[PDB]
Design a protein around this ligand. Structure first.
Ligand SMILES: CCCCC/C=C\C/C=C\C/C=C\C/C=C\CCCC(=O)O
Length: 123
């Protein structure tokens, strides 16, 4: 079972295809490059697509905890990472998948953004 962690280089690939597919305006893309994600439905579906191609989010189960700690805990205790992730894992009470994935991402980065940058970083 070969698991390929998504580095920054891989991330630039997935994110590009999601951009060209979801008709994401280049202006928004500039924001994303500076790690700026506006609270808007465009950005939300963008995050969903990216997180999906990275095999990190599913439209049914939501955030894939296993892959999440395997990815994020790049250089940190996976058990603690699992915990922090779970504190951002919720149910789709909003009933929109783009916003669901976006809420998980937004929740986590607001407390642990450095880990996100490090997870995709080749140490
Ligand atoms: C339930 C909480 C889940 C939190 C998951 C958060 C991040 C997923 C883990 C690793 C992803 C690391 C970097 C990718 C982050 C945003 C997608 C690219 C956005 C962009 O390129 O502009």
């Amino acid at each position: 079972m070969e698991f390929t962690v998504s580095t920054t280089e891989d991330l630039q690939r997935y994110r590009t295809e999601c951009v060209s597919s979801l008709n994401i305006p280049a202006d928004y893309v500039e924001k994303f490059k500076k790690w700026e994600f506006p609270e808007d439905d465009t950005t939300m579906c963008y995050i969903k697509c990216v997180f999906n191609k990275m095999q990190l989010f599913d439209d049914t189960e939501g955030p894939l905890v296993d892959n999440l700690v395997h990815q994020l805990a790049h250089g940190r205790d996976a058990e603690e990472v699992r915990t922090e992730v779970l504190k951002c894992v919720d149910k789709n009470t909003d009933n929109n998948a783009c916003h669901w994935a976006f809420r998980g991402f937004k929740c986590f980065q607001k407390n642990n953004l450095s880990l996100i940058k490090a997870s995709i970083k080749k140490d």
